[PDB]
Amino acid sequence: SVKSEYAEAAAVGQEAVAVFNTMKAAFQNGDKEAVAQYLARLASLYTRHEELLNRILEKARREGNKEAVTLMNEFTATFQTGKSIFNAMVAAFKNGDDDSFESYLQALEKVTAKGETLADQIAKAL
Ligand SMILES: COc1ccc(-n2nc(C(N)=O)c3c2C(=O)N(c2ccc(N4CCCCC4=O)cc2)CC3)cc1
């Protein structure tokens, strides 16, 4: 169903949030090897989430669930804002620009919060 597909995508998103927190702690602790590994993990999780979201979006659209589609489109906008920030943060990491990296972390926390509430709203609209 839309609900079961939603729960699959939710578990991928929940992993992405948890991995981000572990990555951030590694950065603060100076473990750059770990930061690099977790950035690569996040890149793959974001790709997977995008793939899952698009399939759910089209099913909800065919089902005439206009509210869920509207909320999914809002979530995509926040998620893609975060993805673009993430890509710039990966560049800052490999360039050793730690002040840029810190600024991006702050921006990603704000985007993540917007996506967390939208994710809750999507579940209610199903
Ligand atoms: C079909 O559409 C969705 C959308 C979202 C969910 N979904 N459900 C839950 C939940 N029910 O717990 C969660 C999510 C999710 O995706 N979450 C998330 C992942 C990633 C970001 N980030 C990280 C940094 C880059 C930007 C960005 O947006 C933000 C939020 C929060 C947890 C299911 C289905």
Q: Give the alpha-carbon dihedral of 98, 104, 108, 111, to 10 degrees.
A: 170
Residue 97, phi then psi, degrees to nearest 5: -90, 85
Span between the terminal Cα atoms of the chain, in Å:
10
Which atom, in ligand 1's list, is nearest to the CA of 6? 34
Cα–ligand 1 centroid distance for 75 (angstroms): 8
Rg (CA), the chain: 15
Please give the Cα distance from 17 to 108 (Å, whole number).
10
Q: What is the DSSP string of the chain?
A: -HHHHHHHHHHHHHHHHHHHHHHHHHHHTT-HHHHHHHHHHHHHHHHHHHHHHHHHHHHHHHTT-HHHHHHHHHHHHHHHHHHHHHHHHHHHHHTT-HHHHHHHHHHHHHHHHHHHHHHHHHHHT-
How far is Cα of residue 12 from the mean position of the Cα atoms in its chain? Answer: 9
Q: What was the structure determination method?
A: X-ray
Rounded to the nearest angstrom, the gap between the alpha carbon of residue 9 and the centroid of all alpha carbons in its chain is: 11
CA 103 to ligand 1 center in whole angstroms: 21
Which token pair is 75?
A: 């979530």
Q: Let me know: does 118 contact 78? Beta carbons within 8 Å.
A: yes
